[PDB]
Amino acid sequence: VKQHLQRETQLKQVQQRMDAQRELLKKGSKKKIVDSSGKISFKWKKQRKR
Amino acid sequence: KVVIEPHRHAGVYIARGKEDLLVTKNMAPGESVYGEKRISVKVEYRVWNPFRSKLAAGIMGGLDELFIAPGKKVLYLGAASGTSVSHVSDVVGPEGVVYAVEFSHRPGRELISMAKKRPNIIPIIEDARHPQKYRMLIGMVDCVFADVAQPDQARIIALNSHMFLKDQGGVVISIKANCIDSTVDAETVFAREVQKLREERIKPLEQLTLEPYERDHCIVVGRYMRSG
Amino acid sequence: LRLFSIGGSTVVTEWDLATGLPLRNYDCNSGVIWSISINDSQDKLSVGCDNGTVVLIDISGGPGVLEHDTILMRQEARVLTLAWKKDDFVIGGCSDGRIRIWSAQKNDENMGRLLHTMKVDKAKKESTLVWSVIYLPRTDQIASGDSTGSIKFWDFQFATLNQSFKAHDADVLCLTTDTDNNYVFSAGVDRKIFQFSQNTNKSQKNNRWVNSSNRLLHGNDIRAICAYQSKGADFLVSGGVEKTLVINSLTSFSNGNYRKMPTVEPYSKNVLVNKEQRLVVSWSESTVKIWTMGNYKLVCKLTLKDDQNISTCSLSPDGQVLVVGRPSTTKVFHLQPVGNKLKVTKLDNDLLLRTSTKLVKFIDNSKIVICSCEDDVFIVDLPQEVELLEVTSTKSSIKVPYINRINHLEVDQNIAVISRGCGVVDILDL
Amino acid sequence: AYVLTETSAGYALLKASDKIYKSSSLIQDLDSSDKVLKEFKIAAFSKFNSAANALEEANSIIEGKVSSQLEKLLEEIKKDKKSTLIVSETKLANAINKLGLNFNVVSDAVTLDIYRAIKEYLPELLPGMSDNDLSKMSLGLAHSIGRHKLKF
Amino acid sequence: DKASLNDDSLHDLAALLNEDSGIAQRVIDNARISMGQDISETDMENVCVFAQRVAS
Amino acid sequence: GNNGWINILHSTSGLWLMGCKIEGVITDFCIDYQPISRGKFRTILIAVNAYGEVWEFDLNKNGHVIRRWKDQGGVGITKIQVGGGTTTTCPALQISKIKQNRWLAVGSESGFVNLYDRNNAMTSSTPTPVAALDQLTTTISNLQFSPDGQILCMASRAVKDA
Amino acid sequence: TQDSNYVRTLRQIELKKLEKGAKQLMFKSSGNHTIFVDSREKMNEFTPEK
Amino acid sequence: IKTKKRKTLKNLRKDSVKRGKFRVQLLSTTQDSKTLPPKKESSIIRSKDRWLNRKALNKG
Amino acid sequence: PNPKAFPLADAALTQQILDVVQQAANLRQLKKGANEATKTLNRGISEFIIMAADCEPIEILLHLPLLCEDKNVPYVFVPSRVALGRACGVSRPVIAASITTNDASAIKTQIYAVKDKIETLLI
Amino acid sequence: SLAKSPASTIQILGAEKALFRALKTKHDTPKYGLLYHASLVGQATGKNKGK
């Protein structure tokens, strides 16, 4: 059971990274920030889609 | 392959098999309520989950004097979905009966379906707060279980204490601190509650926190002593 | 009529007016209680408690009945004060710096929901909070005193402020009004009282407010105000932490000569003196200090380890015996000298140890008179009783209970005398 | 004096000699037993018609007001022009006070030791007023009222 | 259904399967104490048409 | 001002005449008039909180709330303007020509613009829009009416040609 | 998108097997276990065995 | 010495002995619970009076 | 104005809930539409649930609280679907929304604050 | 329970075997499933049948 829980955590991690990358391809105006800990992430412009 | 072990209380068995388990002698075999499994040894035996049943958190929490037995009559205030109350019907078996009450109507329909199947449960589908509407149909219960999230547990249980409790009887309340107050500490809220019941004639005996099952729930076991 | 009190605990205590007991502890269901107020027609009392919640406890059908009725819709801010408008609206001020308007209405689906939230312009280097709310009936307004030191008149329809004032400097602490709504009195923590007026035709016609006058009369700081305005007299009473009471007039707040009701009123004696070995003895809260004199020196100390009531009625006769009595139990001692020290020994008897004693005096060293809390006179000899001639209960005795109880008694060598506040002086031989 | 019981097999009125002082004696005696049941056992039981529709309308109008069979008890509830009964319910006391009989019934006073006493007692009337295991009739009545109360 | 049951129904059940087995008494008392749904007219006619088809 | 404070200063004196206040956070505000008689007329101040609680005050007597209402929808309100008569951009030159404004515009955070008729909005008191413009994709920051009341110019501030 | 689908499917698989495991399992409890009595001498004389 | 007998005043006064896993406290007296309104809240009253006599106003 | 939908917000909570919606839309951390809300609820990664309170008919949103209770996730009503739609950033009248899990946000703090507020409300 | 489940599942409900094989092997998901036997889908044709 402990093994299964740890496996689940790993899988959800990979799924979330893949999901953000998949959303990175549609539309909008994207903006790249580096969180000063060293993270790479994005932020969209204040822009309601039609 | 699996062996049994009887418990301190009647009807309660610990199944020592591929994993230890908490189980009760079934009333009727081969019929599920909430998708649980089974085990036989022929005798048919039904599990409880200490997660989804609060009294199951009590038994494997360990309570000395639970006032259930086979041939008696118990009251159950708060039987939503009917799971633990059908299980209590199981442990009182054929001769004893339970009177369950409930107010919200989706578990109302669920419990009344379990009442269609199982006989020993008799359902009352009212707001608990006015016991006249069921003193027309209930008489002289033996023991009482109360799991109602309303904050005036003391008022409602003192009301059913004056109306239906057997003398020198047994009562079990459950307490959710994060529902009654949601800011301060567990034993503090618990001491305040049992102060309320002490002033309302209920002589408590013990209480117990359900740590690795619930988030700061406890249960208070007490008696009704020389009172009407 | 009844008297409810909220302590710093989590209960209300509805007291016992005829006796002076806690008639009922009603525990509220939700945490530490901060403030209380009761509705119009005295029908439903309401408490505001630190979990963020407003509890409605309705009282109907005589005294002692305290049943939970309602919870209001709750939020994360501790409620500091409350005030009812009618059977319909509970106004509450809380330390989110803001004032919420809750609905308590019968037969309308908005029962239970807060339906307005008005806000205060906050301080800077603090975390300000609303201290008191009061409802003004005639011009349908609410007033609030808040901890920046300001007085703000909102109007209750449309929940919006009409007037604002930076009256007195530190945090406001109490407000009150006259009845027909011409003067509103505010009182701070910097010993100042300000009177705000509407009374002229022009300020009525615009319903403006203008602060007429101010005054400082206290020593340390002001804690509570109350107003009264009736055909016999028109006055407010202010109570100040400089532990004393002051009295002012309502029509003439700039004019009326104030009265300073003093620190101690000697209706409760704390000390006693006797010529047997030149003793003065003082009982305080749970402590009995004695002195002998002739200069002086102290003798004893009775930190009564058992119980925690204020020592109500104390006594020592000629010789070294001590009675001290509470409305709960008693405590009786034999005392003894050795010189600069004394010695005390507790006696033992269940009758004295259970019974309740309002007043007590000595006949001899041996037979004393016990005034029970229930108006019963025992005699004990160191369980012999005596009948009492009843007084009539009138309609005022029905309304106000405690007028018929035994107020005072005097006993000399033989004849005792008993007095109840209805106007009865009575003679006993015992 | 009269004592009301709304049994799950019927509706009964009983006699009792004088009230409150009798309640003092009762709570100090635990008169819930067959002794006091025999002591003031029977005046008139009326078993309800075994028709769950009449039963549903019965206990519905019992939770609401006085019943038609209750007026069939009221035809000889009385021996004096005000004859005090003990009910366990406020609104029902007030209804039988403010409808056509207008006479006295003690309100919801301390007499619940009394009603729970005859509630411990009525099991010892199991061959007495309605001669069966009444709990089965209770189970049937409860399922009828539940299936009526919820729509289903 | 478990309702429209009478003494001549018990007699014709005796002319049917039996009464002397006591099953007639058992089914009428379980018909008094039964808690399943009193089926309506259409479930009734449908289980009727079902039974008739099976007997044919 | 700060939170709901709108202050009002008499101009050619430099004096403080009067201040009114709503709660929440004042985003915007504008002016309308109402004639009564031969050269007598009351001015009404209109203020929009962020949530969409429109207040309407008057200013002849001191600050007395005429009324409130709530715009339909309206999550982030960020400009209001009245139009169709006299205003802050099309003012009159002598007292007789002051005419009541007819159309009322609320420009939101989305790009939506709710557009109301006053003559029945004031009546129904939580009214429905005459219409709902939904063209742009960014914030609004400029809403201006014609002199005569036909044309509504709306303008963003975040992208080109908006 | 199909990759996110596949990873999501296996994650739900592992989640459900973990839930069936936690349902079929059995832990042990350890909470505040208080006991009341009426005398302080009897309290000080209390023994769980006795 | 007398410091430890002050602590034994605490010992004779206290009402909770732990027995390893278990714990026993007893029921307070009926006359106390009935003829006293219960004790105040130290934390809350301390908070309110601290807010009154903070240093932010130069009282005294 | 809709008495079937029980746990309903007030003014201040309404404002803060729609603001945190606005930040959610600017960060792409939330899912719209009632069907996708139920999807991410069965997959159980939703932080919490917002529902509108004036969708006619009311059952289209009312199928949510059953599962919300069964997984013990807080849900809260806001009384204008058009308002929630413009808050989330789509022209059509949105009636349902869910805020999803991302512990790498910069909106973590406000999410948790409004979460406990909705919780203590929902007790 | 059928109410509790959402819309895209209801578009699926039938062809679960083809679904899970297709998702485990990373191919195209199936569109109709069980809703092929409706009169409306009988009116439509092709990619219109998908929509």
Coordinates of C-alpha atoms in Angstrom, one line a residue, chain B residues 68-166:
Chain B
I68 CA -25.3 -2.8 23.0
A69 CA -26.3 -6.5 23.4
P70 CA -28.3 -8.9 21.2
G71 CA -31.8 -8.8 22.8
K72 CA -32.2 -5.1 23.4
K73 CA -33.5 -1.9 21.8
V74 CA -31.3 1.0 20.7
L75 CA -31.9 4.5 19.5
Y76 CA -29.8 6.0 16.7
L77 CA -29.9 9.7 16.1
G78 CA -28.1 10.4 12.9
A79 CA -28.4 7.4 10.6
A80 CA -27.5 8.9 7.3
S81 CA -27.1 6.3 4.5
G82 CA -28.0 3.6 7.1
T83 CA -24.6 1.9 7.1
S84 CA -23.6 1.9 10.8
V85 CA -27.2 1.6 11.8
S86 CA -27.8 -1.5 9.7
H87 CA -24.7 -2.8 11.2
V88 CA -26.0 -2.2 14.6
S89 CA -29.1 -4.1 13.6
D90 CA -26.7 -6.8 12.6
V91 CA -25.0 -6.9 16.0
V92 CA -28.3 -6.8 18.0
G93 CA -29.3 -9.6 15.6
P94 CA -32.9 -10.9 15.4
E95 CA -34.3 -10.4 18.8
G96 CA -33.3 -6.8 19.4
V97 CA -34.4 -3.8 17.4
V98 CA -33.1 -0.3 16.5
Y99 CA -35.1 2.9 16.0
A100 CA -33.2 5.1 13.6
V101 CA -34.1 8.7 13.0
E102 CA -33.1 11.0 10.2
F103 CA -34.1 14.3 8.6
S104 CA -32.4 15.0 5.3
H105 CA -34.2 13.1 2.6
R106 CA -31.6 11.6 0.4
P107 CA -30.2 9.4 3.2
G108 CA -33.9 9.2 4.1
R109 CA -34.6 7.3 1.0
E110 CA -31.4 5.3 1.4
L111 CA -32.3 4.2 5.0
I112 CA -35.9 3.4 4.1
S113 CA -34.7 1.1 1.3
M114 CA -32.5 -0.6 3.9
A115 CA -35.6 -0.8 6.0
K116 CA -37.5 -2.5 3.2
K117 CA -34.8 -5.2 3.2
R118 CA -33.9 -5.5 6.9
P119 CA -36.6 -5.8 9.5
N120 CA -35.0 -5.0 12.8
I121 CA -34.5 -1.3 11.9
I122 CA -37.6 0.9 12.3
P123 CA -37.1 4.3 10.7
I124 CA -38.4 7.7 11.7
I125 CA -37.8 10.5 9.2
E126 CA -38.3 13.6 11.2
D127 CA -36.3 16.5 12.6
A128 CA -35.0 15.2 15.9
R129 CA -35.9 18.4 17.7
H130 CA -39.5 17.6 18.7
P131 CA -39.8 14.1 20.1
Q132 CA -43.6 14.1 20.4
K133 CA -43.8 13.1 16.7
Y134 CA -42.0 9.9 17.5
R135 CA -43.2 9.3 21.0
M136 CA -46.3 8.3 19.3
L137 CA -44.4 5.3 17.9
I138 CA -41.4 4.5 20.2
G139 CA -41.6 3.1 23.7
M140 CA -38.8 2.6 26.3
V141 CA -35.6 2.3 24.4
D142 CA -32.6 0.7 26.2
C143 CA -29.5 2.3 24.9
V144 CA -28.8 5.5 22.9
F145 CA -26.3 6.4 20.1
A146 CA -26.1 10.1 19.1
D147 CA -24.1 11.3 16.1
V148 CA -25.7 14.6 15.2
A149 CA -23.6 17.5 14.0
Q150 CA -25.9 20.2 15.5
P151 CA -24.3 22.1 18.3
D152 CA -27.1 21.6 20.8
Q153 CA -26.4 17.9 21.3
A154 CA -26.8 18.4 25.0
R155 CA -30.3 19.8 24.6
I156 CA -31.5 17.2 22.1
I157 CA -30.0 14.3 24.1
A158 CA -31.3 15.6 27.4
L159 CA -34.7 15.8 25.7
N160 CA -34.5 12.2 24.6
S161 CA -33.1 11.3 28.0
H162 CA -36.2 12.7 29.8
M163 CA -38.5 11.0 27.2
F164 CA -37.2 7.5 26.4
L165 CA -34.1 6.5 28.4
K166 CA -34.1 3.3 30.4

